[PDB]
Swiss-Prot record, chain B:
Family recorded in the similarity comment: Belongs to the histone H2B family.
Organism: Xenopus laevis (African clawed frog)
Cross-linked residues, Glycyl lysine isopeptide (Lys-Gly) (interchain with G-Cter in ubiquitin): K86
Protein name in UniProt: Histone H2B 1.1
Taxonomy, superkingdom: Eukaryota
First and last residues shown, out of full length: 36 to 124 of 126
Glycan-carrying positions: S78
Subunit comment: The nucleosome is a histone octamer containing two molecules each of H2A, H2B, H3 and H4 assembled in one H3-H4 heterotetramer and two H2A-H2B heterodimers. The octamer wraps approximately 147 bp of DNA.
Function: Core component of nucleosome. Nucleosomes wrap and compact DNA into chromatin, limiting DNA accessibility to the cellular machineries which require DNA as a template. Histones thereby play a central role in transcription regulation, DNA repair, DNA replication and chromosomal stability. DNA accessibility is regulated via a complex set of post-translational modifications of histones, also called histone code, and nucleosome remodeling.
Upper taxonomic lineage: Eukaryota, Metazoa, Chordata, Craniata, Vertebrata
Annotated GO CC locations: nucleosome; nucleus
GO molecular function, one term: protein heterodimerization activity
Length: 85, 89, 280, 269, 254, 249
């Protein structure tokens, strides 16, 4: 691929994150680094939650991660529960 | 907004042959959007203490540390710094 | 997505029935909007001919069939440049007679748009260098539109034109009657690429393990979907056709087609120069 | 953003003059294509005016329902109050509150709808809320002869001002400017004309007590000017934001008011 | 499975003996199919005997409802001292008492179900062949709780071994259960109860404990032990309570 | 003693005569149930012949009289095992031509069943190693069933087959009709084992062929339960007990 998000190793939309930050009127200007950082952090959180929920899907003999799987994964991981609960 | 395509890319990266329901994907979209809102709001607050309200990697970093608990915060900061480094390279 | 839900809960059934009546009236307004959008589509079909002349002149210039005129030359290549910079830009490179036309013009235009940029891979670039023109046209009788990628004689496929058609419905969806924002897509129809030998970039082979199979704990070679822009001509099947995470891909397909039809084709050179970048 | 800093600037810099001049020709044809788009947008504006009457009936019924003038029908009652609800959950919501006969019509309907939209919500201050609780209807209509549209806020008898209707008019230009011919994104705003609110005594929330201008939503009826007094680009930015809010009310909120009341819609799409 | 009590032996068997064991598994599958046909025949026998029991059960219904008067031989049957017990009260809820005497059914009968179950005129059961299963009909009288004359609970059963687990056949199993729609009146639904949450307080109707949840069966394929317990209660009513109803009324069975 | 005894006493007793009428109708229903169980017995006797073919094929395979077929070979020896483990288990042992069919098949099947396992003692194992087949068949006029343990030429006794028969009653008691729950056991008849010299093990499993016919009635009931376990559970699914994949009562 050739996208702004491909220039940082990320699979989340750097461009869309930038647009959302500008559109949200959070500040008056936003640099280019902040979308890269935010998209990277969100990709990391998505990856960690998906890892725990897919491990739980395996422990339940299912190839589809049902929302109950995400609930068990979040509750079990104390940090994720502090972030999302 | 919808990060469904990107969440699916991340899922196939982490677990190749696992899948996700549509309601589970809605829960994931809510997770991503909620974290986005908290990080962006904290970045805005820390930018009020700045000149001309500009948001850079600094404000996102500070928000990440003040919001993400413990190990999660450390790893998040690591990957953010790595990404900004490569984006600049 | 029911913001102000606690309020709706607190409303007395008396006021709740009035709100639901307003929802019914919203459905009626949506139907009138559907008729409006049908008329707007007919208006676009009408304006196709008006746009044809300028688009054809652009195609001729890109292919080097015609040369620029004095009026065309005295148009700034980059709008907003200081004269001391415009002159420097014009004198920064010397004219090469071998270059006949604007090479990789449509490649550059497509890759400057963010959504389309995420679809173009490197192995898709040399094929897209053969893109002579990209045209679009809308239909009323099948109710849809098409995007035509005009390719030249290339060592990648024998197809003279790659066509992508979208059959779209202008009436509100029965599933989401109040979520009508304009014409939605009923289904998408791609094309069959007459790939040459070893050039099909949309498909690859992987030595996967069908041990997760049926009384067969062995590893087998499987033909898997490869990442390419030309998978655009293999659109995701609609609900009716084949039967999670497929409606989203189909919607992204529709969004990319809409970006090409409404954004890139009308302002292609602005994406070539990169003075306009849209995302979605 | 355009100008230089063009994503593909280094490429166009490296292009030989041969193609550099061809790109100039494409820019000229792009200006012509932009002109055709302007004619298209004029036609779309006329189409909006044509459908105004078709939408009028449904919007008038909404005003009647909000004002408690007419009662819902059986078909209207058998419509889910919120979309995407199962029958069990729908029954729970309907049976979660008992009917209060005192409440005639939907209260604060337009106030809630406006404050649920993000852009308009940022304009509503605390002292404007009780005033906006009197908003019986918000209507819009577009004209061709002075090239523009208007938004009318129909209020009830209120202890804040005597105006029955507050009108906001926008005069719009459909042709691209010669300064930025390639920066055409649709009709732009030429000017905006507000209204004079016959405020009662001591109730003018647009004026502070320090008399100086206060922050209020009703400043929406005191739009910025284009032929200002040379005694100022912030005025142009204010005018553009005023136009954006007017478009939010005209194009998004008014067509789908209940979806904002129910909160099932936000500013995007 | 692989956790077979004699797994080490089965692995230790030479391929010669292992293939013979596989042959025994094939013959076992054939025997399982013959058993499936046997259970089908027994079900057909039950359907045939439905008519034989029908006459006696109809006389039971007539006696319980006071439609007919007992005969001399009927009087000459011991109810369970005989003179003292018979002469202990002066002359002038059968299914309620019978169902509440059975332990499993009793755990489902709550206090608010007692007045509702006082309207039970008859309880009947019948088996079907083409839609392989059986049904239980709770015939109610004119009651101020619902308009249903009869509330029916049906069980659809499979008599053939599953293709996924062909060797795990133990007889007819339950495929699914179908309840009934109770025309509950206003404030008479004992299956539902009210609760509130913090803030006029917002009311939240919630699930309640009742025997009539027996007519709201668990789903089979929609997005399991509950279904098995529902089936067990249905089996207790059909096979134990209905055939010997008075024996539960008198308390002569424990 | 009756749980709802007060109910009958507090009953106005006018309807108590109706309750007595219901008691009479219950006696009639009990008789109809008795006829039902008799019909089920006839159905089992009828299905005996249908099971005969498969059971004889089992006997032939276990004794090495016949060889497995291609379809028979392509049946998993253990259910619930994938191709990897199935192939690995098949490759865990090499074929031994010094084995005539399944060894101790019926011994293993009987000792895997819990109730029967409690009856088998150590000295009965070598004797039970000669069991070619265990078969059962039901009678109508004797009103019961029998289990025949077919033994091979053994140095322990000269009996080719040891038979244990149960005579059962399908009719309700005339004195106490209402305690009818189905066919009961009337008596059990064993066999006379022609033991060789010094081989009479009678604690032994073969005391099963010396039937008893509060503690003695308990002996008869447990003997009947063991007979039912052999007839209804072990014989129909003998291989499932051989592999040990099923342990029931």
């Amino acid at each position: 691929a050739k996208t702004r998000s491909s220039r940082a190793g990320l699979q989340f939309p750097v461009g869309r994150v930038h647009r959302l930050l500008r559109k949200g009127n959070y500040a008056e200007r936003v640099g280019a680094g902040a979308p890269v950082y935010l998209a990277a952090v969100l990709e990391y959180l998505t990856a960690e939650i998906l890892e725990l929920a897919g491990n739980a899907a395996r422990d339940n003999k299912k190839t589809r991660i049902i929302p109950r799987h995400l609930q068990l994964a979040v509750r079990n991981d104390e940090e994720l529960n502090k972030l999302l609960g | 907004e919808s990060y469904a395509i990107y969440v699916y890319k991340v899922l196939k990266q982490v677990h190749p042959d696992t899948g996700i329901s549509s309601k589970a994907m809605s829960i994931m979209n809510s997770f991503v959007n909620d974290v986005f809102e908290r990080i962006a709001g904290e970045a805005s607050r820390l930018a009020h203490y700045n000149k001309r309200s500009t948001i850079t990697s600094r404000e996102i970093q500070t928000a990440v540390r003040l919001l993400l608990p413990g190990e999660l915060a450390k790893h998040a900061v690591s990957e953010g710094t790595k990404a900004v480094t490569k984006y600049t390279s | 997505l029911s913001t102000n839900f606690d309020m709706i809960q607190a409303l007395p059934l008396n006021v709740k029935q009035r709100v639901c009546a307003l929802k019914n009236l919203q459905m009626k307004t949506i139907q009138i909007e559907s008729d409006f959008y049908k008329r707007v589509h007919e208006l676009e079909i009408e304006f196709e001919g008006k746009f044809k002349s300028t688009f054809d002149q652009r195609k001729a210039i890109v292919a080097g069939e015609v040369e620029p005129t004095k009026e065309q030359i005295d148009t700034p290549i980059l709008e907003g440049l200081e004269g001391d910079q415009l002159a420097e830009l014009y004198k920064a490179a010397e004219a090469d007679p071998s270059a006949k036309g604007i090479k990789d013009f449509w490649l550059t235009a497509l890759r400057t748009h963010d959504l389309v940029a995420e679809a173009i891979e490197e192995h898709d670039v040399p094929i897209l260098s053969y893109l002579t023109d990209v045209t679009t046209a809308a239909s009323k009788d099948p109710a849809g539109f098409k995007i035509e990628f005009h390719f030249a004689t290339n060592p990648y496929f024998k197809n003279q034109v790659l066509t992508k058609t979208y059959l779209l419905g202008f009436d509100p969806d029965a599933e989401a009657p109040l979520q009508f924002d304009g014409p939605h897509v009923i289904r998408a129809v791609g094309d069959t690429i007459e790939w040459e030998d070893g050039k099909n970039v949309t498909k690859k082979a992987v030595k996967k393990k069908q041990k997760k199979g049926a009384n067969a704990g062995k590893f087998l070679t499987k033909t898997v979907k490869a990442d390419s822009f030309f998978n655009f001509f293999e659109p995701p099947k609609s609900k009716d056709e084949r039967n999670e995470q497929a409606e989203e891909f189909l919607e992204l397909d529709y969004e990319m087609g809409q970006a090409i039809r409404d954004t890139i084709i009308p302002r292609a050179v602005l994406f070539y120069t990169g003075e306009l970048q849209s995302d979605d």
